[PDB]
Amino acid sequence: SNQAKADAVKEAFQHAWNGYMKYAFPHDELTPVSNGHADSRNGWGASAVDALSTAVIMGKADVVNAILEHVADIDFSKTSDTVSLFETTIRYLAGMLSGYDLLQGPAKNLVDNQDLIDGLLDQSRNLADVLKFAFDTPSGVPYNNINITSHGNDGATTNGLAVTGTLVLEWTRLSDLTGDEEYAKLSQKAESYLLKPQPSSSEPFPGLVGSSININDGQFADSRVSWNGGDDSFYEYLIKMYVYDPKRFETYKDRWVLAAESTIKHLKSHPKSRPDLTFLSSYSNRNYDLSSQHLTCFDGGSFLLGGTVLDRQDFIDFGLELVDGCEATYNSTLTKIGPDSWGWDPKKVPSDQKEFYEKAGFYISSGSYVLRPEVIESFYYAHRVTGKEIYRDWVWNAFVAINSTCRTDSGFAAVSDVNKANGGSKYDNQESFLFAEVMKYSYLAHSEDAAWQVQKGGKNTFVYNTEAHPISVAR
Ligand SMILES: *[C@@H]1O[C@H](CO)[C@@H](O[C@H]2O[C@H](CO)[C@@H](O[C@@H]3O[C@H](CO[C@H]4O[C@H](CO)[C@@H](O)[C@H](O)[C@@H]4O)[C@@H](O)[C@H](O[C@H]4O[C@H](CO)[C@@H](O)[C@H](O)[C@@H]4O)[C@@H]3O)[C@H](O)[C@H]2NC(C)=O)[C@H](O)[C@H]1NC(C)=O
Ligand SMILES: *[C@@H]1O[C@H](CO)[C@@H](O[C@H]2O[C@H](CO)[C@@H](O)[C@H](O)[C@H]2NC(C)=O)[C@H](O)[C@H]1NC(C)=O
Ligand SMILES: *[C@@H]1O[C@H](CO)[C@@H](O[C@H]2O[C@H](CO)[C@@H](O)[C@H](O)[C@H]2NC(C)=O)[C@H](O)[C@H]1NC(C)=O
Ligand SMILES: [Ca+2]
Numbered sequence: 001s002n003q004a005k006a007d008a009v010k011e012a013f014q015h016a017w018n019g020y021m022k023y024a025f026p027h028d029e030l031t032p033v034s035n036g037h038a039d040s041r042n043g044w045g046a047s048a049v050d051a052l053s054t055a056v057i058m059g060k061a062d063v064v065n066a067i068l069e070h071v072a073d074i075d076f077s078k079t080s081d082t083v084s085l086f087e088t089t090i091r092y093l094a095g096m097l098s099g100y101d102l103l104q105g106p107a108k109n110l111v112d113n114q115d116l117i118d119g120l121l122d123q124s125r126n127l128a129d130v131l132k133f134a135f136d137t138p139s140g141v142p143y144n145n146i147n148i149t150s151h152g153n154d155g156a157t158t159n160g161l162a163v164t165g166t167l168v169l170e171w172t173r174l175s176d177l178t179g180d181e182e183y184a185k186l187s188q189k190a191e192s193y194l195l196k197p198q199p200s201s202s203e204p205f206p207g208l209v210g211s212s213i214n215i216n217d218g219q220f221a222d223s224r225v226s227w228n229g230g231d232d233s234f235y236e237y238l239i240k241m242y243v244y245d246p247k248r249f250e251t252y253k254d255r256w257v258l259a260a261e262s263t264i265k266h267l268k269s270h271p272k273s274r275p276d277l278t279f280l281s282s283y284s285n286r287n288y289d290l291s292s293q294h295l296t297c298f299d300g301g302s303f304l305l306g307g308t309v310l311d312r313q314d315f316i317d318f319g320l321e322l323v324d325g326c327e328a329t330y331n332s333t334l335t336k337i338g339p340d341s342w343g344w345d346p347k348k349v350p351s352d353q354k355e356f357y358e359k360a361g362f363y364i365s366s367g368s369y370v371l372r373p374e375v376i377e378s379f380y381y382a383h384r385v386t387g388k389e390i391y392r393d394w395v396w397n398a399f400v401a402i403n404s405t406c407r408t409d410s411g412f413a414a415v416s417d418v419n420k421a422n423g424g425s426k427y428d429n430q431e432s433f434l435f436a437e438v439m440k441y442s443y444l445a446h447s448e449d450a451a452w453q454v455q456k457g458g459k460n461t462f463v464y465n466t467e468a469h470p471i472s473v474a475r
Contacts, residue, residue: 019410207258
C-alpha cells in the first residue's frame with residue numbers, strides 16, 4: 001500500500017533527476033519541454049541544491065554524492081545576475097544547511113566523504129558572507145535585490161513583508177552552527193521591526209500587519225493585510241521559530257497567536273454559493289478582497305502546526321477548514337489540480353464561469369499550475385496532526401494528477417489551464433521546488449516515521465523552512 005506509493009514517488013523524483021542530469025546539470029534548472037537548461041537562480045545549480053534534502057530523505061546516495069561534489073566547486077561570489085536575498089536564502093542557504101543537519105544526524109550512514117558534508121557548512125558561511133552587506137542599511141531592514149559584485153542595489157525604498165520576515169530561520173541556524181552570532185543578529189534585527197509594528201495604523205487588527213517596510217526607518221509603508229504571496233512566509237516563520245527554540249523565541253509565538261486569532265475572526269470568508277467552504281480574504285482599509293492564491297494554501301499547515309504545538313484545538317479545527325477549502329479547488333477542476341488564483345466575490349463572477357461558480361464555490365482567475373507544493377504541504381500536516389487516512393489519500397490523488405498531466409520525457413512541466421484536457425499547454429519550465437517540495441511532501445506522506453517527519457505536540461526535532469528543507473531544532 002503505502003510502501004508501493006512511496007516507491008512510486010521515488011520513481012517520479014528519479015525521473016526528473018535523470019532528465020535534469022541529462023540535459024541541464026549543473027545549470028539552475030531543466031527546461032522540460034525543449035530539454036534544455038535555464039539559470040533563473042544566479043547559476044549556482046538551484047535544482048541540485050534544492051533536491052539535496054529530498055534525495056537524502058529518500059536514501060538515494062548516488063544523487064546525494066553528485067550534489068555534494070557540485071556544492072564543493074560552487075563559487076558563490078560570481079554571478080552575472082542580480083541576487084534576491086530571499087530566494088537565495090530559502091533555497092541555497094537552507095538547502096545546504098538542511099543537508100548538513102540531516103547527514104550529521106538521522107542520515108549519518110548515507111555518505112562516506114565527511115569532507116563533502118562539512119563543506120556544506122563552510123559554503124553556507126561563504127554564501128552568507130557574500131550576502132550580508134544587504135543588511136547594512138539605516139534600519140537594518142535589508143535590500144532584497146542586490147548586486148554582489150558592486151555592493152549596489154535596486155534603489156528600492158521599501159522591502160516586502162515576506163522577503164523581510166522569511167530569513168530569520170536559516171540565518172539564525174547558521175549562527176548556532178558556526179558560533180558566529182553575526183548572522184542571527186542581522187536577521188533578527190530586521191525581524192524586530194515586524195514584531196513591534198509602527199505606525200499602529202499599519203496593524204489593522206492585533207498581529208496582522210502591512211505588506212511593505214521602509215528601509216530607512218523600519219516603519220510600515222502600508223496597511224494592506226494578507227496571507228497571499230508577498231506576505232505569507234512572514235506568518236509561517238513566526239510559529240516555526242518558536243518550534244526551533246521555544247526558550248529564545250517565545251515572543252515570536254505570542255505574535256503568531258495574535259495573528260492566528262485575528263485571522264480567524266476577520267479574514268475568514270465563505271463563498272455565497274458554498275457557505276460550507278472557507279478561504280481567507282485580504283484586508284486593506286475596512287474593505288475586503290475576496291480572492292486567494294495557491295500560495296496562500298500553506299495557511300492550513302501553519303494553523304495545524306501551531307495548533308498541535310500549542311495544543312489549541314481551535315487552531316487545528318480552523319486549519320482543517322482551510323485544508324478542505326484548498327482541496328476543493330483541486331478536486332473541482334478537470335485535471336484535479338487546483339488553479340494558481342481564484343475569487344468568490346458574487347459581484348465579479350465571470351459570465352462564462354457562472355455555473356462553475358454556483359457549484360464549485362469560486363471562479364478561476366488564473367488556471368495555470370506551476371508545480372507549486374502548498375496544497376500538498378498542508379495535506380501532509382493534516383495527516384501528521386490528525387492521523388486520518390483521508391488527508392494522505394488527497395496527497396496521493398494530487399500526486400497522481402500531477403504525474404499524469406505534467407510529466408514529460410525529461411521531467412515535469414508547468415501547465416497553462418488546470419480546467420482543460422491535459423492541462424491545456426505545457427510551459428517550458430520546471431522550478432527548483434519540484435525537487436525540494438512537491439516530491440518531498442508527497443513521499444513523506446507515505447513513507448515511514450522518522451525524526452524528519454512532522455510530529456505532534458512538542459516532539460518535533462526538525463522544523464521545515466519555507467522551501468521544505470528540514471532544519472534541526474536548537475540545542
Ligand atoms: C473534494 O473536496 C471537498 C471539500 O474539501 C471534500 O469534502 C469534504 O471534505 C472533508 C472530508 O473528510 C469533510 O470534513 C469532515 O466533515 C465532517 C462532516 O461535516 C459536517 O458536519 C459538521 C458538524 O460537525 C458541520 O460543521 C459541517 O458543516 C458538515 O455539515 C466532519 O464530521 C469531519 O470532522 C471530523 O474529522 C476531523 C478530522 O478529519 C476532526 O478534526 C473532527 O473533530 C471530526 O472528528 C470533517 O470536518 C468536509 O466537511 C467535506 N467538505 C464539503 C464542503 O463537502 C471532498 O471529500 C473531496 N472529494 C473527493 C472525492 O476527494
Ligand atoms: C553589478 O555591478 C557591476 C559593477 O562592478 C557591473 O559590472 C559591469 O558593469 C558594466 C555593465 O555593462 C560593464 O562595465 C561590465 O559589464 C561590468 N564591469 C564591471 C564594473 O565589472 C554588473 O553589470 C552589475 N550586475 C548586473 C548585471 O546588474
Ligand atoms: C506516473 O507516470 C509514469 C509514466 O506515465 C507511470 O509509469 C509508467 O511507466 C511505463 C511508461 O512510462 C509503463 O510501465 C506504464 O505506462 C507506467 N508504469 C506502470 C504502472 O506500468 C507511473 O506509473 C505514474 N505514477 C503513478 C503511480 O501513477
Ligand atoms: Ca513555502
